[PDB]
Enzyme design. Structure first.
Site, PDB file in Angstrom:
ATOM      1  NE  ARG A 160       7.579   4.154   4.930  1.00 31.08           N
ATOM      2  CZ  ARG A 160       6.649   3.612   4.155  1.00 31.08           C
ATOM      3  NH1 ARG A 160       6.412   2.297   4.207  1.00 31.08           N
ATOM      4  NH2 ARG A 160       6.006   4.378   3.315  1.00 31.08           N
ATOM      5  CG  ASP A 197       5.945   0.275   1.113  1.00 26.95           C
ATOM      6  OD1 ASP A 197       5.215   0.751   2.003  1.00 26.95           O
ATOM      7  OD2 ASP A 197       5.598   0.078  -0.104  1.00 26.95           O
ATOM      8  CG  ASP A 214       2.434  -1.465  -0.099  1.00 25.12           C
ATOM      9  OD1 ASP A 214       2.521  -0.786   0.932  1.00 25.12           O
ATOM     10  OD2 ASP A 214       2.706  -1.064  -1.272  1.00 25.12           O
TER      11      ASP A 214
HETATM   12  N1  LIG Z   1      -3.263  -2.638   1.376  1.00 25.09           N
HETATM   13  C1  LIG Z   1      -2.589  -1.843   2.204  1.00 25.09           C
HETATM   14  N2  LIG Z   1      -1.366  -2.208   2.664  1.00 25.09           N
HETATM   15  C2  LIG Z   1      -0.705  -1.380   3.498  1.00 25.09           C
HETATM   16  N3  LIG Z   1      -1.107  -0.192   3.953  1.00 25.09           N
HETATM   17  C3  LIG Z   1      -2.321   0.177   3.494  1.00 25.09           C
HETATM   18  C4  LIG Z   1      -3.123  -0.615   2.649  1.00 25.09           C
HETATM   19  N4  LIG Z   1      -4.310   0.001   2.401  1.00 25.09           N
HETATM   20  C5  LIG Z   1      -4.213   1.168   3.047  1.00 25.09           C
HETATM   21  N5  LIG Z   1      -3.029   1.294   3.702  1.00 25.09           N
HETATM   22  C6  LIG Z   1      -2.610   2.510   4.414  1.00 25.09           C
HETATM   23  O1  LIG Z   1      -1.600   3.102   3.618  1.00 25.09           O
HETATM   24  C7  LIG Z   1      -1.157   4.174   4.446  1.00 25.09           C
HETATM   25  C8  LIG Z   1      -0.057   4.934   3.769  1.00 25.09           C
HETATM   26  O2  LIG Z   1       1.024   4.024   3.478  1.00 25.09           O
HETATM   27  P1  LIG Z   1       2.271   4.519   2.548  1.00 25.09           P
HETATM   28  O3  LIG Z   1       3.166   3.402   2.781  1.00 25.09           O
HETATM   29  O4  LIG Z   1       2.817   5.869   2.922  1.00 25.09           O
HETATM   30  C9  LIG Z   1       1.827   4.460   0.810  1.00 25.09           C
HETATM   31  P2  LIG Z   1       3.175   3.849  -0.256  1.00 25.09           P
HETATM   32  O5  LIG Z   1       3.303   2.351  -0.046  1.00 25.09           O
HETATM   33  O6  LIG Z   1       4.381   4.664  -0.102  1.00 25.09           O
HETATM   34  O7  LIG Z   1       2.652   4.040  -1.771  1.00 25.09           O
HETATM   35  P3  LIG Z   1       1.518   3.151  -2.543  1.00 25.09           P
HETATM   36  O8  LIG Z   1       0.334   3.022  -1.619  1.00 25.09           O
HETATM   37  O9  LIG Z   1       1.268   3.981  -3.785  1.00 25.09           O
HETATM   38  O10 LIG Z   1       2.210   1.845  -2.846  1.00 25.09           O
HETATM   39  C10 LIG Z   1      -0.880   3.439   5.728  1.00 25.09           C
HETATM   40  O11 LIG Z   1      -0.825   4.237   6.877  1.00 25.09           O
HETATM   41  C11 LIG Z   1      -2.033   2.419   5.820  1.00 25.09           C
HETATM   42  O12 LIG Z   1      -3.036   2.695   6.774  1.00 25.09           O
HETATM   43  N1  LIG Z   2      10.259   0.221  -8.349  1.00 24.71           N
HETATM   44  C1  LIG Z   2       9.550   0.763  -7.361  1.00 24.71           C
HETATM   45  N2  LIG Z   2       9.146   2.030  -7.464  1.00 24.71           N
HETATM   46  C2  LIG Z   2       8.454   2.443  -6.398  1.00 24.71           C
HETATM   47  N3  LIG Z   2       7.859   3.665  -6.252  1.00 24.71           N
HETATM   48  C3  LIG Z   2       7.175   3.650  -5.102  1.00 24.71           C
HETATM   49  S1  LIG Z   2       6.219   4.986  -4.550  1.00 24.71           S
HETATM   50  C4  LIG Z   2       4.520   4.290  -4.986  1.00 24.71           C
HETATM   51  C5  LIG Z   2       4.541   3.557  -6.287  1.00 24.71           C
HETATM   52  O1  LIG Z   2       4.698   2.324  -6.342  1.00 24.71           O
HETATM   53  C6  LIG Z   2       4.130   4.321  -7.625  1.00 24.71           C
HETATM   54  C7  LIG Z   2       3.810   3.450  -8.643  1.00 24.71           C
HETATM   55  C8  LIG Z   2       3.330   3.879  -9.820  1.00 24.71           C
HETATM   56  C9  LIG Z   2       3.121   5.236 -10.076  1.00 24.71           C
HETATM   57 BR1  LIG Z   2       2.447   5.745 -11.735  1.00 24.71          BR
HETATM   58  C10 LIG Z   2       3.475   6.149  -9.085  1.00 24.71           C
HETATM   59  C11 LIG Z   2       3.933   5.701  -7.854  1.00 24.71           C
HETATM   60  N4  LIG Z   2       7.366   2.509  -4.410  1.00 24.71           N
HETATM   61  C12 LIG Z   2       8.118   1.713  -5.272  1.00 24.71           C
HETATM   62  C13 LIG Z   2       8.562   0.392  -5.184  1.00 24.71           C
HETATM   63  O2  LIG Z   2       8.347  -0.414  -4.244  1.00 24.71           O
HETATM   64  N5  LIG Z   2       9.280  -0.020  -6.288  1.00 24.71           N
HETATM   65 CA   LIG Z   3       3.958   0.799  -1.672  1.00 25.21          CA
HETATM   66 CA   LIG Z   4       2.956   1.201   1.997  1.00 24.63          CA
HETATM   67 CL   LIG Z   5      12.407   5.648   5.575  1.00 20.17          CL
END
Ligand SMILES: Nc1ncnc2c1ncn2[C@@H]1O[C@H](COP(=O)(O)CP(=O)(O)OP(=O)(O)O)[C@@H](O)[C@H]1O
Ligand SMILES: Nc1nc2[nH]c(SCC(=O)c3ccc(Br)cc3)nc2c(=O)[nH]1
Ligand SMILES: [Ca+2]
Ligand SMILES: [Ca+2]
Ligand SMILES: [Cl-]
Ligand SMILES: [Ca+2]
Ligand SMILES: [Ca+2]
Ligand code: NA
Ligand code: NA
Ligand code: NA
Length: 160
Positions: free
Chosen positions: A84, A97, A99
């Protein structure tokens, strides 16, 4: 004391099926932890920016005695070890990713962790795999996963 953490998996770069299988192996190797359940893999259209490949999404149940932030350390390490890379564009494509959706019934608001995941109740790609592995789930605020999925409009999620 053991807690079940529910982890969402996403990948849309560099062979997502391979990435998710490698992630499952790595999740197995997290200490103080055991994978209890793996969802099906789903092929999902991108939310947010749409100029990217479809995602492979899944969910896993991981029973652990780690502290939540200690679990986060492992998930971040696995993402980084699977290539990543952080680029400029918000919500870009990624190899992996991981989460943390839920950590038992805990509500966590720290610098590195916000649990429950801030937007999971609005994302079918998170809720449907979670319902597959944990149909009886109740959120920390008492809302039932089954009730959300009965009531809120979400598209059907298609298996990979
Ligand atoms: N529940 C959780 N799971 C994973 N990371 C988390 C988290 N809560 C906060 N974070 C933080 O989230 C930060 C940013 O992660 P990113 O992966 O770039 C967001 P993303 O998953 O792309 O989008 P999203 O958060 O809208 O799903 C991490 O550095 C981490 O510290
Ligand atoms: N299908 C799919 N789409 C993705 N888009 C992203 S970026 C953060 C995000 O979830 C996002 C979700 C809802 C709104 Br509104 C805006 C961003 N990650 C994924 C993933 O894991 N699966
Ligand atoms: Ca995510
Ligand atoms: Ca994430
Ligand atoms: Cl990546
Ligand atoms: Ca383990
Ligand atoms: Ca773009
Ligand atoms: Na317990
Ligand atoms: Na411990
Ligand atoms: Na609420």
């Amino acid at each position: 004391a053991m807690t079940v953490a529910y982890i969402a998996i996403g990948s849309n770069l560099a062979s997502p099926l391979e990435q998710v299988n490698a992630a499952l192996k790595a999740l197995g190797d997290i200490p103080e932890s055991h994978i209890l359940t793996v969802s099906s893999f789903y092929r999902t259209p991108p939310l947010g920016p749409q100029d990217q490949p479809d995602y492979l999404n899944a969910a896993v149940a991981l029973e652990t005695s780690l502290a939540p932030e200690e679990l986060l350390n492992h998930t971040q390490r696995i993402e980084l070890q699977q290539g990543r890379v952080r680029k400029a564009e918000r919500w870009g494509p990624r190899t992996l990713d991981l989460d943390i959706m839920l950590f038992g019934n805990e509500v966590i608001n720290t610098e590195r962790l916000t649990v429950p995941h801030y937007d999971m109740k609005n994302r079918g790609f998170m809720l449907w795999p979670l319902f597959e592995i944990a149909p009886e789930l109740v959120f920390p605020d008492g809302e039932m996963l089954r009730q959300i999925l009965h009531t809120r409009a979400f598209d059907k999620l298609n298996k990979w």
